[PDB]
Motif scaffolding. Sequence first.
Motif, PDB file in Angstrom:
ATOM      1  N   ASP A 290      10.601  -0.895   3.358  1.00  0.00           N
ATOM      2  CA  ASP A 290      11.410  -1.038   2.293  1.00  0.00           C
ATOM      3  C   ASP A 290      12.987  -0.327   2.629  1.00  0.00           C
ATOM      4  N   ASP A 291      12.751   0.996   2.959  1.00  0.00           N
ATOM      5  CA  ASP A 291      13.933   1.872   3.419  1.00  0.00           C
ATOM      6  C   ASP A 291      14.858   1.178   4.638  1.00  0.00           C
TER       7      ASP A 291
ATOM      8  N   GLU B 191       8.066  -8.779   8.837  1.00  0.00           N
ATOM      9  CA  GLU B 191       6.848  -8.553   8.660  1.00  0.00           C
ATOM     10  C   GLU B 191       6.350  -9.805   9.106  1.00  0.00           C
TER      11      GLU B 191
ATOM     12  N   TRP C  71       9.562   9.671  -2.057  1.00  0.00           N
ATOM     13  CA  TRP C  71      10.099   9.706  -0.861  1.00  0.00           C
ATOM     14  C   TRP C  71      11.411   9.154  -0.672  1.00  0.00           C
ATOM     15  N   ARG C  72      12.259  10.077  -0.137  1.00  0.00           N
ATOM     16  CA  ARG C  72      13.837   9.474   0.227  1.00  0.00           C
ATOM     17  C   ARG C  72      14.223   8.825  -1.202  1.00  0.00           C
TER      18      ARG C  72
ATOM     19  N   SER D 257       0.809  -1.279  -0.085  1.00  0.00           N
ATOM     20  CA  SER D 257      -0.045   0.194   0.035  1.00  0.00           C
ATOM     21  C   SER D 257       0.861   1.278  -0.024  1.00  0.00           C
ATOM     22  N   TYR D 258       0.312   2.261  -0.469  1.00  0.00           N
ATOM     23  CA  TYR D 258       1.016   3.624  -0.594  1.00  0.00           C
ATOM     24  C   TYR D 258       0.195   4.877  -0.578  1.00  0.00           C
ATOM     25  N   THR D 259       0.826   5.907  -0.392  1.00  0.00           N
ATOM     26  CA  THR D 259       0.040   7.296  -0.272  1.00  0.00           C
ATOM     27  C   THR D 259       1.106   8.340  -0.354  1.00  0.00           C
TER      28      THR D 259
ATOM     29  N   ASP E 144      13.646   6.649  12.416  1.00  0.00           N
ATOM     30  CA  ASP E 144      14.940   7.148  12.530  1.00  0.00           C
ATOM     31  C   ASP E 144      15.690   7.481  13.841  1.00  0.00           C
TER      32      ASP E 144
ATOM     33  N   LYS F 275       0.935   6.940   6.722  1.00  0.00           N
ATOM     34  CA  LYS F 275       2.426   8.094   5.995  1.00  0.00           C
ATOM     35  C   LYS F 275       3.756   7.641   6.244  1.00  0.00           C
ATOM     36  N   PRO F 276       4.326   7.591   5.193  1.00  0.00           N
ATOM     37  CA  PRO F 276       5.992   7.355   5.092  1.00  0.00           C
ATOM     38  C   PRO F 276       6.702   8.487   5.854  1.00  0.00           C
ATOM     39  N   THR F 277       6.241   9.666   5.575  1.00  0.00           N
ATOM     40  CA  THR F 277       6.903  10.823   6.311  1.00  0.00           C
ATOM     41  C   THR F 277       6.896  10.696   8.009  1.00  0.00           C
TER      42      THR F 277
ATOM     43  N   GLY G  28       8.790   7.396   9.046  1.00  0.00           N
ATOM     44  CA  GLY G  28      10.384   7.734   8.654  1.00  0.00           C
ATOM     45  C   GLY G  28      10.871   8.078   9.780  1.00  0.00           C
ATOM     46  N   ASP G  29      10.405   9.348  10.172  1.00  0.00           N
ATOM     47  CA  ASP G  29      11.065  10.334  11.500  1.00  0.00           C
ATOM     48  C   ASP G  29      10.997   9.509  12.642  1.00  0.00           C
TER      49      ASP G  29
ATOM     50  N   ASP H 175       2.541   2.481   4.594  1.00  0.00           N
ATOM     51  CA  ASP H 175       3.284   2.850   3.115  1.00  0.00           C
ATOM     52  C   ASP H 175       4.326   1.763   3.069  1.00  0.00           C
ATOM     53  N   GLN H 176       4.486   1.077   1.861  1.00  0.00           N
ATOM     54  CA  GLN H 176       5.513   0.020   1.883  1.00  0.00           C
ATOM     55  C   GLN H 176       7.058   0.394   2.004  1.00  0.00           C
ATOM     56  N   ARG H 177       7.164   1.579   1.520  1.00  0.00           N
ATOM     57  CA  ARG H 177       8.448   2.222   1.385  1.00  0.00           C
ATOM     58  C   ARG H 177       9.264   2.427   2.817  1.00  0.00           C
ATOM     59  N   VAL H 178       8.507   2.361   3.779  1.00  0.00           N
ATOM     60  CA  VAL H 178       8.995   2.741   5.150  1.00  0.00           C
ATOM     61  C   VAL H 178       9.773   1.421   5.416  1.00  0.00           C
TER      62      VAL H 178
ATOM     63  N   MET I 268      12.640   6.937  -3.315  1.00  0.00           N
ATOM     64  CA  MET I 268      11.769   5.721  -3.690  1.00  0.00           C
ATOM     65  C   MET I 268      10.449   6.195  -4.323  1.00  0.00           C
TER      66      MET I 268
END
Lengths: 211, 213
Positions: free
Chosen positions: B122-123, B132, A169-170, A162-164, B73, B64-66, B69-70, B117-120, A172
């Motif tokens: 991922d990163d 997971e 971002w960074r 899932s995304y939003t 970190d 939210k990834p934002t 992320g914070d 968000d998947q990117r979290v 990616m």
Amino acid sequence: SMKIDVVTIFPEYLQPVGKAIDAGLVDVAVHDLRRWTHDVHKSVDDSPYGGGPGMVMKPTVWGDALDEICTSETLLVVPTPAGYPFTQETAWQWSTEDHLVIACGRYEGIDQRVADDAATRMRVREVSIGDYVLNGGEAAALVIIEAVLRLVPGVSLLEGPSYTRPPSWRGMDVPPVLLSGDHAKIAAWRAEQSRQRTIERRPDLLGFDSP
Amino acid sequence: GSMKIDVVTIFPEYLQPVRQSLPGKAIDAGLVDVAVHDLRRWTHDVHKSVDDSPYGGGPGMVMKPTVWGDALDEICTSETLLVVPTPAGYPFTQETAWQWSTEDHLVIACGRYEGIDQRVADDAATRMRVREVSIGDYVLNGGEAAALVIIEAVLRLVPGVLSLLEGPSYTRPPSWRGMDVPPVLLSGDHAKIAAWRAEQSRQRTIERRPDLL
Ligand SMILES: O=C(O)c1cccc(CSc2cccs2)c1
């Protein structure tokens, strides 16, 4: 409308007060099993018959309690690693019930005669929420309640990523397809993802061998 | 030995029982420390937002990834093991609890709704170990109770802190409501009792769990 009862020797656990948001579609009560003992020491356990490590919960104290709380229409839930699997299908089924009573055991277990007895007045289900061991049914009680309550009127395979916002971002990026608006292409990509993820994380779900 | 568990969640009150279920002596001996964190100190707006609409359409929100992320970190080091409970996860088993029982820092990210968000993840995985995991085959609203299970399951394996199926157990009194304790258990014949229990276990497992066989 639905009534859930919980019995434990550690009644402080279930007090979160998610499952908390209720406009009176269900009422939940928690009881201290020590409310049904008689001796000064409040003894609820004894050593096993036949030998072995640990203590067992006494049959007499649980029996009294359940007499007071349970009826013939009741479903009795006993969380235990030795029970039948508790699945999505079990949650759906119990979402239609009028009365649930969850029995929390500690130590090694509860006398077998307690659930054999109950099974002659009401319906009993011994259940395991997963293939691992806890110290007591208290956490399991919570999981069962969350899973059941979110299906109550008035509230396959695995699900892919899932995304939003934001779209980048960074360094990616969100997969382009999701941004393009093609309901077709997006459903297809999503189906591919969901399936590609099951084959990896859960091969058994598509009838394959577990790692 | 000496273990630290951080939990991030938009419900820090939910995790009251884990820290209220701890032996004081293990806290004194530095065997375990548990800290719960409210995901909103890392929010960027005056409304304090944690989620947002799914890219691609759909019902339910995405986290939210934002913000995560914070948060990570700040909490995570590179020795950190990052646990993320989700129904789409790998299975959390007893083998998994044993393994994690020897870890030094456990970070558990509690997500809600339809995920983070998947990117979290991922990163994070470019600089730590991420896992997971699913505690069973059912959907819960959020990751909180899953976290409870995992914590209790792992810590009861750290000394001094907290295959078939096990068969029935009995205790005093020998007769209760017209049911007797199986007479073999009072026999004094321990080679014989070991075998009786074995049959009981097999029968049970066939009935309740025919997968394991
Ligand atoms: O019945 C008992 O006395 C007893 C003893 C130990 C633990 C528990 C709940 S443990 C649980 C494991 C997996 C699903 S639920 C119950």
